[PDB]
């Protein structure tokens, strides 16, 4: 089917814009290596409050009460991170 | 097949989804292995 990510992005921008305690200035649209760093710079603040020994269990109690399974989503993300996709190295631009 | 490093945790996910706490059952089974329970019997079966 032909119903792409823009429908889900329109809901992602809502979940941000209904948590934004509106600033005086706009926010910065990070590139993917500040996204990777922001994830780990935050996880390294979470895991000083919550031990990883109980994390996925406590998350499954909280989110399983709303019908999410975490282990399935993890094993999907393991198979997605094992997937040998497209071969890189784009050719030369326009003219020389 | 299963490392003990994850056993009680995985069992608590599976059986906690059905309403069981393993930690209270273990702490009961610890007290049921520490408890100095009775030796010879008080008088049941009184027609003996």
């Amino acid at each position: 089917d032909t119903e792409g990510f823009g429908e889900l992005l329109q809901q992602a921008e809502q979940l941000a814009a209904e948590t934004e305690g509106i600033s005086e200035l706009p926010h910065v649209e990070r590139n993917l290596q500040e996204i990777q760093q922001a994830g780990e710079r935050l996880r390294s603040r979470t895991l000083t409050r919550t031990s990883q020994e109980t994390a996925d269990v406590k998350a499954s109690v909280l989110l399983g009460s709303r019908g999410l399974d975490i282990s399935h989503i993890s094993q999907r993300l393991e198979s997605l991170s094992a997937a040998t996709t497209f071969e890189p190295l784009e050719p030369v631009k326009d003219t020389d | 097949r299963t490392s003990q490093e994850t056993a009680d945790v995985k069992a608590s996910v599976l059986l906690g989804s059905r309403g069981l706490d393993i930690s209270h059952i273990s702490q009961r089974l610890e007290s049921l292995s520490a408890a100095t329970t009775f030796e010879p019997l008080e008088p049941v079966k009184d027609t003996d």
Partner: peptide, 18 residues
């Protein structure tokens, strides 16, 4: 803990195939 290590794998096959 063994059955958890299988029952989840069954769901990975199920949401891949149906």
């Amino acid at each position: 803990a063994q059955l958890q290590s299988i029952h989840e794998n069954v769901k990975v096959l199920k949401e891949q195939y149906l």
